[PDB]
Design a protein around this ligand. Sequence first.
Ligand SMILES: [Zn+2]
Lengths: 83, 83, 286, 48
Amino acid sequence: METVVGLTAIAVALLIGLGALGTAIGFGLLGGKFLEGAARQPEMVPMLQVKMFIVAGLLDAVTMIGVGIALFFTFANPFVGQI
Amino acid sequence: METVVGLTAIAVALLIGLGALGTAIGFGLLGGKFLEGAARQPEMVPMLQVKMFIVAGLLDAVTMIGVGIALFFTFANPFVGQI
Amino acid sequence: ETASGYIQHHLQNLTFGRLPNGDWGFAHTAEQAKEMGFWAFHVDTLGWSVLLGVVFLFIFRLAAKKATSGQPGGLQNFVEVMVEFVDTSVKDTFHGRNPLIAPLALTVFVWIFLLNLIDLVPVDYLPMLAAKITGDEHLFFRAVATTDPNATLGLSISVFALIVFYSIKVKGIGGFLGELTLHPFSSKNIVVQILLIPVNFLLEFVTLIAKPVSLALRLFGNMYAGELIFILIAVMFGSGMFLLSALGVALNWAWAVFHILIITLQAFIFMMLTIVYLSMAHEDNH
Amino acid sequence: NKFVNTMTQKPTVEQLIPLHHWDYLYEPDAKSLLDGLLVRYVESQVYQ
Ligand SMILES: [Zn+2]
């Protein structure tokens, strides 16, 4: 058990950590274009905002599937049941 | 068996974590150019959005294969039955 | 007591459920609370969420049951600045006639802000006042309701029901499955559209399920990590030293000055994603 | 003189130097373009 349980804490840290790394760089690239678009067209700000939040759903989908399987490995364990 | 099951937990975290990292940065790049184009040509926005979703399918294609194989390695295990 | 025991006690909820013999009793230990299954209730979460929601609507009703339509009194001037702010936020995103979207956004913003604000009061005050009023010395009691994943999941799974509802109510059952299987990729050839249904379903279904989870866990993560830092800074004062109980005050002050910005911002993001996700369920965005 | 009609010429003093929601791509710097376009505008006013 000690290895299957200790290598599940490393599994959890990579599922949430690699997702935390990619979402902070992805929203910083997406947001950098939203703030310039908001300057080039001050009257388009309400349209640019609703379109940015549509992209945000695509940007975080795989990251959020990983914060769920990581929480599922932290309070339940599909590997410990296999001895 | 405890080493195969423990290494499988890390294999699963590595499949989804690298996919989360890649798609989040990929959509940050793709979506950033969609907001840049939407600001210059607000008449083109409905056409640009259709072309953005054509590319979104190519961007997440391999990532989906990775999360499909990752879930397969948690609820079933092709390695445990090979020992 | 030890620092580990002090931290372990602050992370347990007041649970009530099916004991080994009877459906009427409070758990006295964390294990006795984990034995209680899905058919249990956190009485501190439901006692803080319901009490703060009724205080908000009662105060907003006092300024609606007697609205002047002329020069406003101090109370109604504030309530109208909030309704005007929410209505403007909804009109810059939603263009339809739906009467539910505007009061929902006001309810979501003001309630979440109040459930988050109780984190600023000192962390041992309410837990000890509950123990002194009850006569116990081992009573579990957590004040900040948005630090419980069940409370934040309840708020998002309910917004998700309204998203699946309005999507079927205006697009029809055919339009709901159409956006879920014929969008974003469509083709004239019958063999091609059938081979594109699995690809369209993977793309659209994943994004839909991620909406409620991301709304609940963004709120839970910012509040749970926010209170953990206050509990950890309180252990610096538990040491009893002088040059540590002086450094702790600076960290607590700096963290509270930072946390009031986070508490205000998290209520605004939850409101804006509720407005955006309900508005994109009323039109074909593709 | 301003050409009011074939029978009337009006002498005038006119100021020169002290002079839709989409943007151009501005291939060279927009500030550089302005520094050039304004000189062509004053010359075109003097020529007219
Ligand atoms: Zn569509």
